[PDB]
Design an enzyme around this catalytic site. Structure first.
Site, short mmCIF file in Angstrom:
data_model
loop_
_atom_site.label_atom_id
_atom_site.label_comp_id
_atom_site.label_asym_id
_atom_site.label_seq_id
_atom_site.Cartn_x
_atom_site.Cartn_y
_atom_site.Cartn_z
N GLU B 162 1.13 -1.09 0.06
CA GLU B 162 0.13 -0.10 0.19
C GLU B 162 0.80 1.25 0.20
OE1 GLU B 162 -2.55 2.06 -0.94
OE2 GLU B 162 -3.24 0.12 -0.84
N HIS B 210 -4.26 0.14 -16.87
CA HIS B 210 -4.82 1.06 -17.78
C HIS B 210 -5.18 2.54 -17.33
CE1 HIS B 210 -9.29 0.42 -16.27
NE2 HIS B 210 -8.35 0.13 -15.13
#
Lengths: 338, 302
Positions: B162, B210
């Protein structure tokens, strides 16, 4: 019934809408009117980055608006009439109406339902009334009406064909955009007198358009105002108001209808063409959504049932208020003055 | 082919979209949770006028999301799952994302041109995680994927990587769900390249490529390739365009969504992802087609 995927599909349907309106605003399909071409050359002709132009192209292909073979994009023949900017059915006006006006307003649909009021102030910082904006911008109104005129062809054809204009001596169309309906009447009914009533601002322009098409002596333009009720329409035994009532609140609809009733000849007939909600106000779908479009954009426009229109005709003084079904998307609401 | 009316109807599809999101935002459907009700009674409970609420109700009936008989609106039982605010499948989350973010962003699409459960289920069912000893998930939202893996493969070590300013938050959420000792939280950044992922022989990156331009995708893939252990496997789950980039339609549209909502995001073909995996140094770059909406692009470090 429907499923979660359907709701998600429709909640994302603004994707397809803006892919189309962007392509129209960019005049993207114009670049394919002569040849097929790959994304990089379309982007060159459009003065746009290759990558993003390609993203728009792939989307338009995936939506079925373009073909693609071996990397070359192709405009389908049957799409030319409405995707090319010089074709008489070009959709560009609607696209820009959506981009500049309807899409921003529907962004605030939630608040329009919360307040039962237009969001033009919210969205555009414009605190003018709907009537103000229209009276002040006759060019936008003309552009609007000439766009609508294209779509109205099935109504006009079905009106001319299904209603007997031979029974009347003089027909007047209130607030015609471009004269399309009385032209079609003239083409099929050689002996009936014909007129259009326009606001004093819009009248010379329509007179010029009628004259250019060769109808300047066949169809008179008279000046008047349905709102103030200044309607020199007494010599016309058939009067028609095309798809205007739903632009106004019912109370204003009553004023318009009373104004026309007062000005009509005795024994005269009046017809409003509208697209009513069905009998149980369950649809049809586009009309139901058109009602919401009236909510967000006008000061009190709304769609109504046939019966609701009948009630307003009677309250305005008309006798024999009735529905006349005709071919096309409109329904005729008809009444007489006695 | 398509007609004028097809294009008109689609150009106005934002009508239907906003009818649904406004209805969700207004909690209109919750007013039919326990009984049928007419427009005036729904309006009252919504603190909305009857005329405008009735217009929205009529459109929802006409769209098929409500039934209506003699003025009483009915919420179809098959619709409760995604229209009611308290139901696990409630779409209010999407409506809010559309209302506050996507719909305004798409309003300027032309200027931008000119300038998850089913994946998890098909991944855990289709892929044999037992062939690995340590699995790391990069950019994991709330750790739904490692928790699913934990529930099916009690032998594998699990971790999430994270960002620094999100790690304590994720540690807490994981602990509150009972996984605080089963799933480790390491801190790192694929863009920066600080990635303490050496101990995990399977690393996964969920639907992130993406979000970025192909150039930044290469930087991300090179960063992950370098930090991986020798012999390790890496999986990026994406929704690629098909072989001739003619679709699928939602992914084509999603590509424009990446255009207006990220800096350089875009969808790619399978072959283009493979190309980038190879350019980044990966070996045996290949496509694994699992169940669900995503495809796996897979590489190894020899």
């Amino acid at each position: 019934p429907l499923t979660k995927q359907d709701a998600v599909n429709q909640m994302m349907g603004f994707f397809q809408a803006k892919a189309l309106t962007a392509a129209l605003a960019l005049k993207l399909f114009d670049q394919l009117r002569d040849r097929d071409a790959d994304a990089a050359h379309i982007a060159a002709r459009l003065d746009c980055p290759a990558r993003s132009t390609e993203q728009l192209l792939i989307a338009l292909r995936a939506m079925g608006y373009l073909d693609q073979r071996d990397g070359l994009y192709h405009l389908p023949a049957a799409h030319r009439a409405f995707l090319l900017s010089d074709e008489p059915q070009w959709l560009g006006w609607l696209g820009r109406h959506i981009d500049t006006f309807l899409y921003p307003l529907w962004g605030e649909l939630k608040t329009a339902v919360r307040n039962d009021a237009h969001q033009r102030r919210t969205v555009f910082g414009d605190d003018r009334s709907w009537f103000d904006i229209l009276y002040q911008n006759p060019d936008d109104v003309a552009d609007f009406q000439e766009f609508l005129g294209k779509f109205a062809a099935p109504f006009i054809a079905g009106f001319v064909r299904d209603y007997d204009f031979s029974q009347h001596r003089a027909f007047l169309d209130i607030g015609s955009g471009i004269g399309s309906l009385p032209m079609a009447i003239a083409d099929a009914y050689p002996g009936i007198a014909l007129a259009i009533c326009e606001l004093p601002q819009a009248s010379a322009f329509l007179r010029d358009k009628l004259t250019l098409q060769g109808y300047g002596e066949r169809i008179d333009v008279v000046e008047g105002d349905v709102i103030s009720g200044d309607l020199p329409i007494g010599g016309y035994d058939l009067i028609h108001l095309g798809w205007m009532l739903h632009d106004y609140a019912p109370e204003t609809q009553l004023t318009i209808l009373r104004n026309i009733y007062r000005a009509m000849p005795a024994g005269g007939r009046f017809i409003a063409s509208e697209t009513p909600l069905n009998e149980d106000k369950s649809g049809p779908e586009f009309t139901a959504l058109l009602s919401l479009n009236m909510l967000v954009s006008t000061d009190g426009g709304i769609e109504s049932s046939a019966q609701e229109y009948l009630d307003r005709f009677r309250l305005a003084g008309f006798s024999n208020a009735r529905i006349m079904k005709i071919a096309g998307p409109r329904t005729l609401i008809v009444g007489e003055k006695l």
